[PDB]
Write a protein that binds this ligand. Sequence first.
Ligand SMILES: C[C@@H]1[C@H](O)[C@@H](C)/C=C/C=C/CC/C=C/C=C/C=C/C=C/[C@H](O[C@@H]2O[C@H](C)[C@@H](O)[C@H](N)[C@@H]2O)C[C@@H]2O[C@](O)(C[C@@H](O)[C@H](O)CC[C@@H](O)C[C@@H](O)C[C@@H](O)CC(=O)O[C@H]1C)C[C@H](O)[C@H]2C(=O)O
Ligand code: HEM
Length: 390
Amino acid sequence: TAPPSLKAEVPPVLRLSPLLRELQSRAPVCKVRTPAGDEGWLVTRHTELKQLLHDDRLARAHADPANAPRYVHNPFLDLLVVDDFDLARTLHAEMRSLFTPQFSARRVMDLTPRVEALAEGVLAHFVAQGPPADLHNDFSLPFSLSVLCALIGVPAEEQGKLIAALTKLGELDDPARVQEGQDELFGLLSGLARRKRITPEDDVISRLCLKVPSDERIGPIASGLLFAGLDSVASHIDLGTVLFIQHPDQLAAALADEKLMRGAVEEILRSAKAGGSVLPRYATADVPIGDVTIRAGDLVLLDFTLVNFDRTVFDEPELFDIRRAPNPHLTFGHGMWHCIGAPLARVNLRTAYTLLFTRLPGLRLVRPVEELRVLSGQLSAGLTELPVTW
Ligand SMILES: C[C@@H]1[C@H](O)[C@@H](C)/C=C/C=C/CC/C=C/C=C/C=C/C=C/[C@H](O[C@@H]2O[C@H](C)[C@@H](O)[C@H](N)[C@@H]2O)C[C@@H]2O[C@](O)(C[C@@H](O)[C@H](O)CC[C@@H](O)C[C@@H](O)C[C@@H](O)CC(=O)O[C@H]1C)C[C@H](O)[C@H]2C(=O)O
Ligand code: HEM
């Protein structure tokens, strides 16, 4: 297969696939065939990813968005792209000025007692019947979701439908099912905005109303935030928990020392996914990078965790070392595109690991890790299940 194809099934969890390892050793920027069947440029190395994150010729913009080369087939992902390059710039700037104040240090610090309290409640439900239990579906997802709902302003009576609607939102190669969850989610969130415009509450939707006069527009905006943080946080709770099970003496040191726990969270972010953490861009003009020229209109695949195994940056990247320092991973991106939820994601993760392992020090897998499976055909795909006992 020339160019190499990315849809090479799914590698085992917590391991860098042979395909991606050879692509990275081959060149910093590689032409590949995407899961959707089109052609794209995979950025494989740390320095080149950083450079492209700071190059204003990469954008969520294309002269013909409907016909542009695709990474995967998903209409919700397609909503990030507009056909006017000036409009793409101003929309991106606007979105960052809307969202950045919601994740200030004061706000995340102030939310933290609430985050810890939500973790405690989810844990009670997770352990209520004793072991074994599914860490993914009965702790990681409900905890990740309850935090996002508390911050965004989704009441309890609607959180039950969210996991379902958000699941069908991420489905690949089924535009009709993505449209269903899109309909259901956009209608739910914009109705909340209509209410909170009249009766403001301490949540993000209420504060978005003060700068976004359209309730309709708050639908996709809020949906973006939820989808950006739900599976991303949940899957890192899952995989970080496995990494800790596999490295008990490092887990013991992280539990005894908060600074070591912060380092451990960073090492889990660096290494848990081990490639495949791709978001797309398009070139709006020719971009020379490494020894190739990305052409205007071309698809560019930014893989934010493949670069965390770049041997020219990380010594022994395949080893889990919570004391790794410095730890310049790019899991949250960089620059003008840097993940706005990163401070919240970090609090969620250290809250989860701290609570889980102090309450359940015997946590272990029910079956060998080789038997875990990632859901297929899913944007932001996580484990089907994570059975644990304690
Ligand atoms: C300007 C507009 C307009 O006015 C309005 C009218 C339009 C709004 C448009 C809304 C549509 C939003 C787009 C969502 C797409 C998500 C794709 C996720 C893909 C996830 C990928 O997954 C893969 O999939 C493959 C198939 C599998 O083979 C792989 N093994 C793997 O699983 C990679 C996963 O990514 C990360 O997860 C983080 C991502 O979430 C981030 O945090 C959000 C980034 C992005 O979402 C930012 C937006 O979301 C912010 C949004 O808010 C913008 C916004 O409204 O602007 C408003 C103001 C973390 C996971 O570790 C990583 C992972 O899994 O490795
Ligand atoms: C461990 C969990 C998470 C990871 C690994 C992660 C990763 C990322 C990455 C790599 C990007 C850059 C995407 C690109 O350049 O196209 C990004 C952007 C973004 N993330 Fe996250 N994220 C996480 C959690 C969250 C959470 C919890 C939220 C919201 C509560 C969030 C909201 C956003 C937003 C709004 C953007 C768009 C920034 C922009 O377009 O300039 N993320 N995230």
